[PDB]
Design a protein around this ligand. Structure first.
Ligand SMILES: *C/C=C1/C(=C/c2[nH]c(/C=C3[NH+]=C(/C=C4\NC(=O)C(C=C)=C4C)C(C)=C\3CCC(=O)O)c(CCC(=O)O)c2C)NC(=O)[C@H]1C
Length: 310
């Protein structure tokens, strides 16, 4: 059973209670983007990340309580049609915005209950070839190797691993692609506690997460609770959600400035992760994340196929 989050008087997490951290409701985001929440009927803006006004070039007083009809006149009708009440929470509306103050932005929206969650961040054949390369891989080891090399080629990440969960939830690096000079993790195994049970559960439902800068302080949502419910805003489906500080510290101690993983899901179970590191902070472009999501699904399919052959 989850502890209350920090903003509802819950404890700071320690190694005795890793599994009790409510990582899905941190009430805060990473500073490389901005987040709004809005009422799913009216489009009234209900919450904003503290950086949202500055990030979007709006007056703080003007942004709170404004409507999406007024803020996003060109997207609001399409957004409503795309995300009706009761639609799957995983369903997304995506648009590219020409925003003079911030530049070209990627807008990603999903619905949870009666709330729309809007994520804004900057945005800037390969997919076909990568997809084909995974399919054409001859066995599981080769598939793992191709997956890591292909993801590294697409992303530029310093390290890309295939991290496989054992039945006891320990993990092992079973393939990696790595920059010259980096220590090998191939064949190394790690305790189950380093990716705790609630993280593993979340990663079965929401298939990509990241920390763009492992030193960056989280930016709170204001108000922190959804005014509709007087309860935490669900952020499991928001890539911008703040990462657990316990994990951020783990990464800093490894010399990792930026981290990203994609779930590999086989028979509805979390089989492993495509796990990526960069030494320097690094925001993987939105279009590249979409490509990785496609490759995660392809790898998942191919792991099942390869495991059936062998
Ligand atoms: C006492 C609790 C601790 C803890 C909790 C924790 N860890 C995560 C997320 C991840 N941990 C990962 C572990 C590894 N990455 C590696 O590269 C290696 C070894 C080579 C390991 C063992 C990974 C891959 C994740 C996924 C996230 C990512 O890809 O960056 C969470 C949940 C984080 C979040 O989503 O907010 C939590 C709560 N970690 C510990 O080390 C102990 C101290």
């Amino acid at each position: 059973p989850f502890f209350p989050p920090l903003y509802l008087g819950g404890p700071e997490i320690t190694t005795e209670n890793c599994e009790r951290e409510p990582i899905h409701i941190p009430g805060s985001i990473q500073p490389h983007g901005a987040l709004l929440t809005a009422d799913g009927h009216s489009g009234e803006v209900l919450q904003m990340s503290l950086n949202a006004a500055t990030f979007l070039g709006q007056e703080p007083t003007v942004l709170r309580g404004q409507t999406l009809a007024a803020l996003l006149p060109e997207q609001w009708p399409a957004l409503q049609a795309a995300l009706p009440p009761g639609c799957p929470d995983a369903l997304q509306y995506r648009a590219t915005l020409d925003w003079p103050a911030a530049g070209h932005l990627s807008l990603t929206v999903h619905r949870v209950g009666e709330l729309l969650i809007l994520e804004f961040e900057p945005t800037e054949h390969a997919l076909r070839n990568a997809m084909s390369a995974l399919e054409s891989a001859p066995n599981l080891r080769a598939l793992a190797e191709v997956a890591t090399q292909t993801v590294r080629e697409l992303t530029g990440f310093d390290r890309v691993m295939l991290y496989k969960f054992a039945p006891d939830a320990t993990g092992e690096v079973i393939a990696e692609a790595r920059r010259e000079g980096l220590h090998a993790f191939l064949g190394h195994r790690f305790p189950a506690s380093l990716i705790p049970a609630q993280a593993r559960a979340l990663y079965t439902r929401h298939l990509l997460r990241l920390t763009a800068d492992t030193r960056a302080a989280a930016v709170p949502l204001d108000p922190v609770l959804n005014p509709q419910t007087n309860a935490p805003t669900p952020l499991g489906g928001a890539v911008l959600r703040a990462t657990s500080p316990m994990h951020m510290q783990f990464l800093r101690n490894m010399g990792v400035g930026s981290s990203l993983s994609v779930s590999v899901v086989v028979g509805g179970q979390l089989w492993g992760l495509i796990a990526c590191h960069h030494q320097t902070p690094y925001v993987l472009p939105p279009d590249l994340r979409t490509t990785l999501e496609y490759l995660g699904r392809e790898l998942s399919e191919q792991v099942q196929v390869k495991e059936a052959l062998e």
